[PDB]
Design a protein around this nucleic acid. Structure first.
Ligand code: DLU
Ligand code: DLU
Ligand code: MG
Ligand code: MG
Ligand code: MG
Ligand code: MG
Ligand code: ZN
Ligand code: ZN
Lengths: 65, 47, 260, 242, 260, 47, 65, 242
DNA sequence: GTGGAAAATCTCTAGCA
DNA sequence: ACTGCTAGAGATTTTCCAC
DNA sequence: GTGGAAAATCTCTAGCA
DNA sequence: ACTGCTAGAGATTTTCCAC
């Protein structure tokens, strides 16, 4: 069930930000969570966002629908 | 070498030039006559 | 030309005319005019039009003391969510703040406390309380309220709510608790359409869940990647692969990537 | 689409809940809820318990989350209605209190506490409590020397009991358990909200008789006519709100 | 449904939950929740996120009194150009301001003075001075400094200059005059790459030139236009005609337009 | 009919509702108990 | 000379603004000046900007170029 | 293109300046300036004059713009170097003073006034003045009864003299004349700036001999070789800086 | 049509009591 | 019935120089 | 593929000492 | 070596509802 656990970790939403943009970017897909950085995928674009700029949730309103 | 002109805190008069010791996102650590200070980049100018 | 820059230097020493005035009047390139301006200390009176970003980690709390009706309200906000714990204290003292923080650590997982340098926050009692509970103490640059933006914002918001419920509580502590309740559980919006309480539950639950899942995958999915040193595989798919390269996470297309 | 039969048979032979089906067979939670609710043979997180513990001439109000063992303990000046109402208001503000169990005491049945429960929405009612209180006693005794005051000792004990103490089914602390339980409660609330949102819609397929809408998907509409959960292409089924 | 509106109102009466909270919790349309919120007086605590724009006519001057080193500096700015006249006055009195304004009217065509409601701008002496020189007097909304957004800005800029030339002047009046000189003639930029003095010269010269040219064209280019009422022609070109229609200027393509 | 909730001047507390008499760009003229006031639209909300 | 005085009137530049945009619009071409409004033409778009939002100049750095 | 021969011929037969030849023929003003700068037979705005006029025991410093009749009049406490230096500093700040004429008086030759002229850039030097001062005196005599102090009377007289006395070539007030004159000076300065900017460029056409550049355009490059202004397509002429 | 420095444009902030 | 702006500092984008 | 109400998104401001 | 944000009010843009 390694694939299923991978899917579970990809079921989260990561609202992140860049260095100069103040607005919170959209809900990317959490590919990997690490101590200092989180690897996400926003519209087929793999990014490494620092932990101090990432909000990882699992939107239950969007999950239970 | 970098020259940093900074407004440290509650002092409208600007100071410097000081020596830049470290540059980050929104904070510069500078050395003015052996005095180490941290200044938001909104209140620091680097040349 | 180069002998026409001494006139620019003189007129700058007298009038500190900006680079554009020097360039236009003395027929100079913008480069040399800007160099003349940049050589004068008196004309360095502006920073960069930017705003940094505060730490939004799941375990960082921002604290501050506000004053209302001659009473001190100690307010803590979860930066990642927006969940506020507030209390009216008798006077602004280090021991009152230490008790507030000790309460906070026991009810939510505080891993870092961000505060202004106020006499109460920098005391030794608060330092000992943080040491006991294993809290990292972060202090903003002196007289830089923007560093604490989140909590400062909350004050405004919090005060707003009080002004709407102050006719339902005879004392300020009851109104403060009502405002905290309303902000936490009756004011939704934000990122997930949540309220602050739901948001904090979600953030903490997701942190624990993803930590557990990642530990499981690491225990299982063990690989080494030899692209183009022996990095550690993180995520492979969609024609690309993410690899931790001696603490330098790099993403590379499937080509020139060997997962051994 | 093409995943319902396995879940239905699994539930028939194991009477399993709806999260299991919705996570193992990848269906929208509403349709799994309907599957579990269609069989009659196959048909809490917000309740706290309040108590007073007297130590060193000081009364400690302890609120225990019976589902998790999560303690909120604080010393209060006196067993007065105002102080207990303040404690209840704080408890409501921090965590989602829905009902509170007391001991019918003099301080738990005052007009002030009654109006505090009424305002915060709490609903008053008159072996987890005893075990958790005893655990607080033990931990306070362990960490009473580290502080000069009983309030600080109580807060240290609450912190240890909630977090430093790891015991349970999987070696989990009370904080993690309460976070998980409240997350599940939020999930249930979202499910009920979406079910009530869609329940005002009737779908006609192919006309045939009306139907109950379970999922207006992007490219597949799942409805149910007479306990028959069937998926249809969007070019077959027409809805009307009533 | 409509019976859930009663519970939404009852929860709003206590908690004043925002429209989103009521819509989510009580299963209401956004319109109904928003209407319920909009019916409460205590939840109307925010204006509209906008900023008006000040009058930029060529003949409007903005005046204000600033304080530096315990000395009053009366500052006037040409809004259309940015050209400032400043003077250090002994005390913030109505007579000093009247003298300043009378000086100003004789050196540049002041057609209107925009000022805050300060005790020295609403005086009767200033009223009489304005009457004499035919100046319209505008007063900003009380305690609305943004209305004077131009001159106040100069109070900053001017002050900055005084901080660079202060060591070259032994008294504040001389430094103020030096700062006015530097801002007007040695600090370029702006719309035309000009300095404030050249910008004001250009604005006024263009005003007179366009006035006389337009008077000529009106004296000669006379027409009556019927489109789709006997309005008056302004500009016919590129197949599009501009017509003044009883003070309602309308631009219409060549079709459905007759210049008689 | 329009209800205007306004913050006239140097008073954090809001007031109203007040009848709306005129609406411009950055200024609303309102009547609150026969008192006519001009409020910048940054300090007036119309319903 | 009525076809060249028109050119003279159109040799000016009108930096204007709208009712919600704070930044000054580019140098349109002054087609007509009136007591209360100015009719200008910015990229083949005839507009009627109020006088309280228009800066009419005759930029000489450009005229002498 | 087209109308350059017309410009040169009109000039030789009428020795007209460059503004006329560049507004009646639509040339780049640099090219017209070059055209007028080719024949020897065809080869001020910042001039101010100070004076002191004494009325009622008060000295009024009057600065007259010779080209326009534009008066700046101020009653000053005394004929001291400080007061005249202040007046000069104000005059420089408001209008572009280049050189200034005085009467070699004791107030107009002090180290303070010298340093004020040096700082502001003014250059000291020792029938418009008399007529304009008499006009100011007459208008002050007219409007003295309309004010108490003499400073107010002086300012009223200055306002009337500058803006309400319409007498001249076409009924123009002094303010209009000074605005027009300063506008013309700015125009001349811009033209000289452009000329000095291009004068470092050498252009070769078709090579042939070098050339002096007069205008580079979108698709027309106007240059000149041996007092011969000719236009060339950009695909024919190459520039360099030297 | 291609790269590289350079000039223009755009974005954004402190301070004006 | 009246109204935020200015000037500077980086960053990004065109644009002209040379093939 | 076409319009209309509605929901989402984006822009922008007051106030936090 | 550290750092502006938040919540609300209008306006604009998709988007689904019905053919
Ligand atoms: C004596 C302590 C220690 C030293 O610093 C002072 C002064 N101070 C000032 C503000 C303040 O300026 N608030 C307004 C504000 C303005 C802009 C913004 F981004 C955030 C904002 F909060 C505070 O909030 C605050 O807490 C303090 C404070 O506590 N102290
Ligand atoms: C006693 C008079 C009459 C009644 O009003 C007061 C108070 N006041 C206040 C500011 C002021 O708030 N300046 C800071 C500022 C802030 C924001 C902005 F957009 C512009 C700004 F200037 C003034 O400038 C000012 O001149 C006055 C003044 O003169 N008065
Ligand atoms: Mg503080
Ligand atoms: Mg604060
Ligand atoms: Mg003022
Ligand atoms: Mg002011
Ligand atoms: Zn300088
Ligand atoms: Zn309300």
């Amino acid at each position: 069930e390694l694939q299923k656990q991978i899917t579970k970790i990809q079921n989260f939403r990561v609202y992140y930000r860049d260095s100069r943009d103040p607005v919170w970017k959209g809900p990317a897909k959490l590919l990997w969570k690490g101590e200092g950085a989180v690897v996400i995928q926003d519209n087929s674009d793999i990014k490494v966002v620092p932990r101090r700029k990432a909000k990882i949730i699992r939107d239950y309103g969007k999950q239970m629908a | 070498n970098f020259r940093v002109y900074y407004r440290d805190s509650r002092d409208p008069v600007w100071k410097g030039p000081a020596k830049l010791l470290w540059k980050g996102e929104g904070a510069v650590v500078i050395q003015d006559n052996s005095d180490i200070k941290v200044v938001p980049r909104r209140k620091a100018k680097i040349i | 030309f180069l002998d026409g820059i001494d006139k620019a230097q003189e007129e700058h020493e007298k009038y500190h005319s900006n680079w554009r005035a020097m360039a236009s009047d003395f027929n100079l390139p913008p480069v040399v005019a800007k160099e003349i301006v940049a050589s004068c200390d008196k004309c360095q009176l502006k920073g960069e039009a930017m705003h940094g970003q505060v730490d939004c980690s799941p375990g960082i709390w921002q604290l501050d003391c506000t004053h209302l009706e001659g009473k001190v309200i100690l307010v803590a906000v979860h930066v990642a969510s927006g969940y506020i714990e507030a209390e009216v204290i008798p006077a602004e003292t280090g021991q009152e703040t230490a008790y507030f923080l000790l309460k906070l650590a026991g009810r939510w997982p505080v891993k870092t406390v961000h505060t202004d340098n106020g006499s109460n926050f920098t005391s030794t009692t608060v330092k000992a309380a943080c040491w006991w509970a294993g809290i990292k103490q972060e202090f903003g640059i002196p007289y830089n309220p923007q560093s604490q933006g989140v909590i400062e914002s909350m004050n405004k918001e919090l005060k707003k709510i009080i002004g709407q419920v102050r006719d339902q509580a005879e004392h300020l502590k009851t109104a403060v608790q009502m405002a905290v309740f309303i902000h936490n559980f009756k004011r939704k919006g934000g990122i997930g359409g949540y309220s602050a309480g739901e948001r904090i539950v979600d953030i903490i639950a997701t942190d624990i869940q993803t930590k557990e899942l990642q530990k499981q995958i690491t225990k299982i999915q063990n690989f080494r990647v030899y692209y183009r040193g022996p990095a550690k595989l993180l995520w492979k798919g969609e024609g690309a692969v993410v690899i931790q390269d001696n603490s330098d996470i790099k993403v590379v297309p499937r080509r020139k990537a060997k997962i051994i």
